[PDB]
Design a protein around this ligand. Structure first.
Ligand SMILES: CCS(=O)(=O)Nc1ccc(Oc2ccc(F)cc2F)c(-c2cn(C)c(=O)c3[nH]ccc23)c1
Ligand SMILES: CCS(=O)(=O)Nc1ccc(Oc2ccc(F)cc2F)c(-c2cn(C)c(=O)c3[nH]ccc23)c1
Lengths: 107, 108
């Protein structure tokens, strides 16, 4: 539907290109980053890559579904990371833009 | 606006009465909770009590403004607390509702 298309073509597109998007565009690599607790704390990993793919394979049945995955991705980052780490700020920024654009979503 | 009238009447009506709302209805009280570092970590405390009041006094110029306060209240909670605290789960459960509701907000 129109909403999933807006989330694809408008919202995801804007976040994807953002100067802070690079760490979010594929799943967290726990080994490559030296985060061996990661999968013990974050039991539902999400990333914009997985979300984009799902938006391409028509995985979602409603907008809120897709919205939830955005939220888990952010929530996850805020839960695992220290408050002082830049990655947290990076998510706050992206998260704010997601909300901004969701207000302008159709229906 | 249409959008803000949706947040007050649909969104906040549903969140304010939820069995998990209670820790969120008024500002985090660092003294009462024995959290001396709370204000050192969270710089923009937010709560539904504040948001409801703002909805009631038409403080917000646009819908998205309100949404960011709801966001900050949640983000605050996730950043301050331990991953395993119940308070997180409670925030998580309100936030799902918030987001589900926000998907059905009009557009003007
Ligand atoms: C495709 C992602 S990747 O995994 O393949 N690469 C990758 C690269 C850098 C990353 O973060 C950094 C950011 C800014 C710096 F200055 C240094 C960093 F290391 C993260 C990262 C992501 N996320 C969600 C976190 O929560 C998190 N916590 C700790 C690291 C991370 C992931
Ligand atoms: C109404 C504001 S209040 O401050 O006056 N009362 C109050 C009472 C209980 C609370 O949490 C609990 C919930 C359920 C339990 F079983 C035990 C708890 F402690 C919190 C609370 C809120 N928030 C946002 C937090 O981030 C947080 N972190 C640590 C506590 C909290 C605030």
């Amino acid at each position: 539907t129109n909403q999933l298309q807006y989330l694809h073509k408008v919202v995801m597109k804007a976040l994807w290109k953002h100067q802070f998007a690079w760490p979010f565009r594929q799943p967290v690599d726990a080994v490559k980053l030296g985060l061996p607790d990661y999968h013990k704390i974050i039991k539902q990993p999400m990333d914009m890559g997985t979300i984009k793919r799902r938006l391409e394979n028509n995985y979602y049945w409603a907008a809120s579904e897709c919205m939830q995955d955005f939220n888990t991705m952010f929530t996850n980052c805020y839960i695992y990371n220290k408050p002082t780490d830049d990655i947290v700020l990076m998510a706050q920024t992206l998260e704010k833009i997601f909300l901004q654009k969701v207000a302008s979503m159709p229906q």
